[PDB]
């Protein structure tokens, strides 16, 4: 739109989030230890 306008969401970022391979981890300073996020234990894709 305009140069001064706020930055639009990146389509690359949207696609990367959709693929769901960004790494999320348990918090270091949470007691008791947090559960494993559902992303960290997903299985490998069946097709290369």
């Amino acid at each position: 739109g305009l140069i001064s306008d706020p930055v639009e969401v990146d389509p690359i970022q949207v696609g990367r989030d959709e693929a769901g391979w960004v790494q999320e981890l348990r918090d270091r300073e949470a007691w008791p230890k947090q559960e494993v996020p559902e992303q960290a234990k997903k299985p490998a894709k069946v097709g290369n």
């Binding site: 690359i12 696609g15 990367r16 693929a19 391979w21 490998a44 290369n48």
Partner: protein, 54 residues
């Protein structure tokens, strides 16, 4: 009583804020994949070789 005027003095004698050392970065596997901008979605796909059963 005599009231002398003297300047403030600031000196550095080698006492410093204590900070740990850096040992972790030399241990993990750094840069096995380089061309991240080339691939789509900033994602490099790594292929695990196949396995078979008799």
């Amino acid at each position: 009583a005599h009231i002398f005027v003297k300047p403030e003095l600031v000196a550095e004698i080698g006492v410093k804020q204590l900070q740990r050392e850096i040992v972790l970065p030399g241990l993990v596997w750094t840069n096995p994949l380089t061309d991240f901008g080339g691939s789509k979605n900033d994602t490099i796909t790594v292929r695990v070789p196949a396995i078979t059963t008799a």
